[PDB]
Scaffold this active site. Structure first.
Site, PDB file in Angstrom:
ATOM      1  N   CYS A 101       6.479 -37.475   8.557  1.00  0.00           N
ATOM      2  CA  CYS A 101       5.916 -36.438   7.994  1.00  0.00           C
ATOM      3  C   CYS A 101       7.161 -36.287   7.121  1.00  0.00           C
ATOM      4  O   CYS A 101       7.179 -37.233   6.130  1.00  0.00           O
ATOM      5  CB  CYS A 101       6.137 -35.091   8.859  1.00  0.00           C
ATOM      6  SG  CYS A 101       7.536 -34.918  10.259  1.00  0.00           S
ATOM      7  N   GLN A 161      10.546 -29.530  16.821  1.00  0.00           N
ATOM      8  CA  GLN A 161      11.348 -28.724  16.532  1.00  0.00           C
ATOM      9  C   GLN A 161      11.218 -27.072  16.820  1.00  0.00           C
ATOM     10  O   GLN A 161      12.379 -26.481  17.018  1.00  0.00           O
ATOM     11  CB  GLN A 161      11.351 -28.776  14.812  1.00  0.00           C
ATOM     12  CG  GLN A 161      11.870 -30.110  14.117  1.00  0.00           C
ATOM     13  CD  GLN A 161      13.470 -29.704  14.199  1.00  0.00           C
ATOM     14  OE1 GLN A 161      13.719 -29.023  13.550  1.00  0.00           O
ATOM     15  NE2 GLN A 161      13.965 -30.671  14.739  1.00  0.00           N
ATOM     16  N   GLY A 168      10.550 -36.346   9.598  1.00  0.00           N
ATOM     17  CA  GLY A 168      10.245 -37.392  10.690  1.00  0.00           C
ATOM     18  C   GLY A 168      10.735 -36.862  11.924  1.00  0.00           C
ATOM     19  O   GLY A 168      10.930 -37.790  13.096  1.00  0.00           O
ATOM     20  N   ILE A 169      10.845 -35.513  12.242  1.00  0.00           N
ATOM     21  CA  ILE A 169      11.354 -34.834  13.503  1.00  0.00           C
ATOM     22  C   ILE A 169      10.369 -33.927  14.401  1.00  0.00           C
ATOM     23  O   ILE A 169      10.145 -33.999  15.512  1.00  0.00           O
ATOM     24  CB  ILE A 169      12.804 -34.585  13.438  1.00  0.00           C
ATOM     25  CG1 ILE A 169      12.695 -33.456  12.473  1.00  0.00           C
ATOM     26  CG2 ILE A 169      13.698 -35.879  13.278  1.00  0.00           C
ATOM     27  CD1 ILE A 169      14.486 -33.141  12.303  1.00  0.00           C
ATOM     28  N   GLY A 170       9.716 -33.153  13.374  1.00  0.00           N
ATOM     29  CA  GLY A 170       8.905 -31.805  13.609  1.00  0.00           C
ATOM     30  C   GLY A 170       7.441 -32.451  14.046  1.00  0.00           C
ATOM     31  O   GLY A 170       7.246 -32.366  15.399  1.00  0.00           O
ATOM     32  N   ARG A 171       6.767 -32.353  12.919  1.00  0.00           N
ATOM     33  CA  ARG A 171       5.347 -32.934  13.293  1.00  0.00           C
ATOM     34  C   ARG A 171       5.328 -34.126  13.914  1.00  0.00           C
ATOM     35  O   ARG A 171       4.361 -34.513  14.730  1.00  0.00           O
ATOM     36  CB  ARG A 171       4.388 -33.024  11.813  1.00  0.00           C
ATOM     37  CG  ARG A 171       4.447 -31.438  11.226  1.00  0.00           C
ATOM     38  CD  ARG A 171       3.861 -31.686   9.793  1.00  0.00           C
ATOM     39  NE  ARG A 171       4.018 -30.256   9.205  1.00  0.00           N
ATOM     40  CZ  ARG A 171       3.709 -30.256   7.915  1.00  0.00           C
ATOM     41  NH1 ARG A 171       2.939 -31.137   7.464  1.00  0.00           N
ATOM     42  NH2 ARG A 171       3.721 -29.050   7.183  1.00  0.00           N
TER      43      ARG A 171
END
Ligand SMILES: C[C@@H]1OCC2(CCN(c3cnc(Sc4ccnc(N)c4Cl)c(N)n3)CC2)[C@@H]1N
Length: 486
Positions: free
Chosen positions: A420, A467, A423-426
């Site tokens: 995304c 997240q 690179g951590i949430g979606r």
């Protein structure tokens, strides 16, 4: 530890807490009341309390007058080691510790003794323990053997906690932590080992609807998600490579870095510092690479990574530009065009538009070696909202179902690349849904799934995967929808 986080306090309680129980430099963090989904870092400075806003719409923690972070723990750890960074400086010297046990894994609050004994009997093992509310007192229930259940009474006498004798504690956490290190020994030799908190999050897949309904009541989803957030303090693994001078402009956000123990090391080697990409291998228990959206200066590194890992499928979960901001540079050529990205060559063979996504058929090969050519399928999900999550998981599910079959049809395909902006949430959301659905896909409806265990497992491979509570709820809703249409 993460005791500076108080989950049930108002801004006024925080003011009085820091003014009466803190000193200059004392701080705490808390969830917002005026804007749910946001956070407040409350700091004491010059006899007065400053309230600093932290916003998380699903991509990162964005501190006002500060930087962007993958976790609240990484944020606090950064300001507690890099002074003069938060502004007229604001110093985070002394965490004001929280005595409230709501986010403890072992704390259940309202739960009867029969419910607790039924939970420890059907779900427990040696050392499994929980703490429940008794009229202001508590009950510690522990299982021992290979078997029985013991009930230790916890008295609250003048704002302190004890089990009948010895030490008096300021919190149930301090009592639990003490009897975890120094176990109570029963008369005839039984050691009350508080080995691990009783697992109550692992559910049989067929009962997902019942659990979602219980979590939806007045909210259960929030306690479970905040309990999971308290466990992030255990995941402060080193990120030294991402901190190196030659790697700093290779990161989209300077403080959202890959863990050194899971980072993708590049070996294409153009000789001084060619081994870094802000990316991590994610292995369940099919593999993934969780990565940030490209920068103009990392496009070549991305294709070297895709080539080295034998990845055949890329899942892009953001538009290139969102809310006027660049989230990912265009790293693929226009349709029918051929472009060279360093030593790599990419042709965009064909683009196919679907309602929620676009599939791009790419051909990747190393310049000078035609025999290295492989098709890389880029699945570009285009309808994810700017903030929050989709109101229905149907679009994301049909997309993951398609990505899954493309990956399964390619023999010896490497890890699926997911990205995304940070690179951590979606990214974490898409990967966790794909992990849980792969279980329900192979082991049928009669399987055990544990959403926070899966997230904790993916979070030890990349900081702050998943997240928000809205994403966490989206994961439950997606697993539920998958099971219902089976
Ligand atoms: C007041 C509330 O009562 C119930 C409560 C919420 C749900 N519960 C719970 C327990 N543990 C986790 S983290 C976890 C789970 C599984 N594997 C791992 N590895 C981790 Cl890290 C979680 N998110 N929720 C029980 C505790 C709250 N205290």
């Amino acid at each position: 530890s993460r005791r500076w986080f108080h989950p049930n306090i108002t801004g006024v309680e925080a003011e009085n807490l820091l003014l009466t129980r803190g000193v200059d430099g004392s701080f705490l963090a808390r969830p917002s009341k005026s804007n749910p989904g946001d956070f407040t870092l409350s700091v004491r400075r010059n006899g007065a309390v400053t309230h600093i806003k932290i916003q998380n719409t699903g991509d990162y923690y964005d501190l006002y007058g500060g930087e962007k972070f993958a976790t609240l723990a990484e944020l606090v750890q950064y300001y507690m080691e890099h002074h003069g960074q938060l502004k007229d400086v604001i110093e985070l010297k002394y965490p004001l510790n929280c005595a409230d046990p709501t986010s403890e894994r072992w704390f259940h609050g309202h739960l009867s003794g029969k419910e607790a004994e039924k939970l420890l009997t059907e779900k427990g093992k040696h050392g499994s323990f929980l703490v429940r509310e008794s009229p202001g007192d508590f009950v510690l229930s522990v299982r021992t053997g290979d078997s029985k259940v013991t009930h230790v009474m916890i008295r609250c006498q003048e704002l302190k906690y004890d089990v009948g004798g010895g030490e008096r504690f300021d919190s149930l956490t301090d009592l639990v932590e003490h009897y975890k290190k120094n176990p109570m020994v029963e008369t005839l030799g039984t050691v009350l080992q508080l080995k691990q908190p009783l697992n109550t999050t692992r559910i049989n897949a067929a009962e997902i609807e019942s659990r979602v309904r219980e979590l939806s009541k007045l909210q259960g989803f929030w306690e479970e998600f905040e309990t999971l957030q308290q466990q992030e303090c255990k995941l402060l693994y080193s990120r030294k490579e991402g901190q190196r001078q030659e790697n700093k402009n290779k990161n989209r956000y300077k403080n959202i870095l890959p863990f050194d123990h899971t980072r993708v090391v590049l070996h294409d080697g153009d000789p001084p510092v060619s081994d870094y990409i802000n990316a991590n291998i994610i292995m369940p228990e099919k593999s993934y690479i969780a990565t940030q959206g490209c920068l103009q200066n990392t496009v070549n590194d991305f294709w070297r990574m895709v080539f080295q890992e034998n990845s055949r499928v890329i899942v892009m979960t953001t538009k290139e530009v969102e809310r006027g901001k660049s989230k990912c540079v265009k790293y693929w050529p226009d349709e029918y065009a051929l472009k060279e990205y360093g030593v790599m060559r990419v042709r965009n063979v064909k683009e196919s538009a679907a309602h929620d996504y676009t599939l791009r058929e790419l051909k990747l090969s190393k310049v000078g070696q035609g025999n290295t050519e492989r098709t890389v399928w880029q699945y570009h999900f285009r309808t994810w909202p700017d903030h929050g999550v989709p109101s229905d998981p149907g679009g994301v599910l049909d997309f993951l179902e398609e990505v899954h079959h493309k990956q399964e049809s390619i023999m010896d395909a490497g890890p699926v690349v997911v990205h995304c902006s940070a690179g951590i949430g979606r990214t974490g959301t898409f990967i966790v849904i794909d992990i849980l659905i792969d279980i329900i896909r192979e082991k049928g409806v009669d399987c055990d799934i544990d959403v926070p265990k899966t997230i904790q497992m993916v979070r030890s491979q990349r900081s702050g995967m998943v997240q928000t509570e809205a994403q966490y709820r989206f994961i439950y809703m997606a697993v539920q929808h998958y099971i219902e249409t089976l």
